[PDB]
Write a protein that binds this ligand. Structure first.
Ligand SMILES: [Mg+2]
Lengths: 377, 372
RNA sequence: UCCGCGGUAGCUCAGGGUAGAGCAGCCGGCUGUUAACCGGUAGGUCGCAGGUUCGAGUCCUGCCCGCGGAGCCA
RNA sequence: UCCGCGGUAGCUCAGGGUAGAGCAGCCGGCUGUUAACCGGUAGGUCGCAGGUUCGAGUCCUGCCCGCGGAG
């Protein structure tokens, strides 16, 4: 029976079998040390004599668990046998154990197919899966049906079918993971924003539970709790940036602007979260539910200065869609295929999407969003 | 506080608020009958006089729950107020309530955006969702890590997490959902075949739990339990098709052959499931683990005569990859220079599994928005 | 296009006269290493193709990749 | 590729001389409908483009599309 590094303290004094990779080796001749990496951690293995493969070789190690303050984690294994399941032919391009430092951020990307093996490298990917797991959990408990489509339209079509649906699919920095929610029979864009506060809360919970070790391994600072998130109207934000930050802003907020509104919110409310509501019709799709004062039932979520979520209520009346197409100078009978479904009693609905990697990145304090993705372009 | 159709019996004699669509209406003058569909089913609503929107209109109904044998499901609502949240402008192309019949197969597909609203139409989709919920739940409990990629990638991720899975769309009917599993540090293909059995079991369990009503609605027949599934080597099955089924088979089993082997399994073992092991190298990808006798550590799962799973062990020795090819795949091989664990995997065709489980006429019924 | 900084060993980087050293590697040595270190030894499209020079990694010309600034963006 | 059935209201199918019927739609009637039905009414690229005929959904030449069938 195999034992994971994370379960060693329970087998202190016992004989154990280990399966992992040769993380790193230090040969002193008479005695030598093995760092053995598995999906749960790394553990020191003591031995001697016998030749060892190059690092990154698949290994089976059978030995005796022992306490030792000298070893990382306070525990080590005295080797009785070291079997090699798969030997490494050459030395790795980069010294994996000596990451993240020791290798420029760019070199790490050129050798993703092996640098990803590092503890800190894989960590974000583990935390992300946790976030997504909690994502589905909550929505499922809330009577959401997961759908599998071939984009904005299909979700909508499915609302007249299941009332509440969600999807986790790739979209086109470049190619990213998008967590899309869409629910029917709502009152207004408020219903959506409330759902997202609860959903995010759950998503973070799941990460904190099933991905604690990784979260601590990265030394990330956990955000304030996603509840009663501050709301600013696009106009209100436009004014603050101007009069208080001396940063002239256009009709649409730039990444640079959102960064500032973030820092602003962190100071006035001590909140790592910020809701920007009521965008102008001009900067939002034609299907966005319009308001009388020239704005729209929309919103963006700024987590730590970065936008991680965009959504709002859609138009559901057939005529009001044409109305919106004309006002935005667009050919109505070019959207004939899209308009069809709205001829048949479409409920008041709306949705939003979360950027998995954006969220992951700003959560773990990663330098670049590309770290939150397994294989960037 | 909204009440779903499935929760009405607990509210008899009380005042409830319903949210759904006008599934159908029967107007008899001073009295009319509404069939109100929501995500949990349809209930009969009684009223009279007032104009009712065309079918398929979004509605809000406040009324009193009442027992009545004449009513479908034994329950009906006497409405005190009928609010219209969104009127339908035109009649639907097809009479949704009168599906599946009453409309040719190819027609339902041409009006998906609305016919999908039928109870039997959406049923498979709800079930496929359950099957996938189970898929993830099990693998999660077994220390698997879910990954999100742009075949090779899954392998690379093995040296990172040892055990990974992914639920992603593929191409190669035209666009289908694939449930891919890949795990390292295995003994042989047996470890994989044993995992798939335990997996399918958990999956069908989840379908039963969370998609029970739909499974009953479609009137499907449940398969035998996926355990100790009969195994049959490619050579062995080849012979059976020939001598006992008089169906000449080439170097590769055609769909027609696979369907006959299914009927065979149901007779000999009374099993809706069947593994086909040991395929000739010639008829399997280069990355497949070769054997001494020309065969390979591969397998195919035949659910009710239809392949729903294909897999086997992969080659993990850098040299043996060129040996089974070379410099064309220079970017692929690179990872195999650095201690690749003995590994393997398989992928499940989500729609295929859902189709054959629910006895659907054709695979496209399991897909929300099929290609053409 | 102009200015500036970058392009040198598997990795990180030094430098008008052999192109050099740490880490990774190889050989030898070493019973407690935490980025072990000691000796020896291998390792190159110095960006590429042409010039000045006895001599070019260094200077000249053109061109290729990258970052920042100026400019351009009727 | 060949062969054989198909293509008519929206849907599903009737048939050498206004192109029709029930389903739903519209108007009118009905307090227990389960695919409610009674009357009235609206609804067309008869596949598309060329021929025979005084007249073609109907026949005959080519093509597009669907289903099915062949070692
Ligand atoms: Mg000029």
């Amino acid at each position: 029976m195999r034992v994971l590094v994370r379960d060693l303290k329970a087998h202190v004094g016992q004989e154990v079998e280990l399966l992992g990779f040769l993380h790193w080796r230090r040969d002193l001749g008479r005695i030598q040390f093995l760092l053995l990496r598995d999906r749960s951690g790394v553990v020191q293995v003591v031995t001697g004599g016998l030749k060892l493969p190059l690092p990154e070789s698949a290994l089976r190690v059978r030995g005796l668990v022992v306490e030792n303050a000298k070893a990382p984690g306070g525990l080590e294994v005295q080797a009785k046998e070291v079997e090699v399941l798969s030997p490494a032919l050459e030395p790795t391009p980069v010294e994996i154990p000596k990451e993240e430092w020791r290798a420029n951020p760019d070199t790490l990307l050129e050798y993703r197919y092996v640098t990803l093996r590092g503890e800190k490298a894989r960590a974000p990917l583990k935390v992300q899966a946790a976030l997504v797991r909690g994502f589905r959990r909550y929505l499922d408990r809330q009577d959401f049906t997961e759908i599998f489509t071939p984009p904005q339209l299909y979700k909508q079509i499915m609302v007249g079918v299941f009332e509440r649906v969600y999807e986790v699919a790739p979209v086109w920095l470049n190619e990213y993971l998008s967590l899309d929610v869409e629910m029917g029979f709502i009152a207004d864009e408020e219903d959506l924003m409330r759902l997202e506060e609860a959903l995010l809360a759950e998503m973070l919970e799941e990460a904190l539970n099933t991905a604690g070790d990784e979260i601590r391994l990265l030394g990330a600072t956990w955000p304030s709790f996603p509840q009663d998130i501050p709301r600013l109207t696009h106009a209100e934000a436009k004014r603050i940036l101007k009069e208080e930050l001396g940063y002239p802003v256009g009709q649409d907020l730039s990444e640079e602007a959102e960064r500032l509104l973030g820092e602003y919110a962190k100071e006035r409310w001590g909140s790592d979260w910020l809701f920007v509501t009521r965008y102008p019709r001009s900067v939002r799709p034609f299907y966005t539910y319009p308001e009388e004062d020239g704005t729209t039932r929309s919103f963006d979520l700024l987590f730590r200065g970065l936008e991680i979520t965009s959504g709002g209520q859609r138009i559901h009346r057939y005529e009001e869609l044409l109305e919106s197409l004309k006002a935005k100078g667009m050919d109505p009978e070019a959207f004939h295929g899209y308009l069809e479904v709205f001829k048949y009693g479409m409920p008041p609905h709306g949705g939003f999407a979360i950027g998995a990697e954006r969220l992951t990145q700003k959560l773990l304090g990663l330098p670049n969003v590309r770290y939150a993705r397994a294989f960037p372009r």
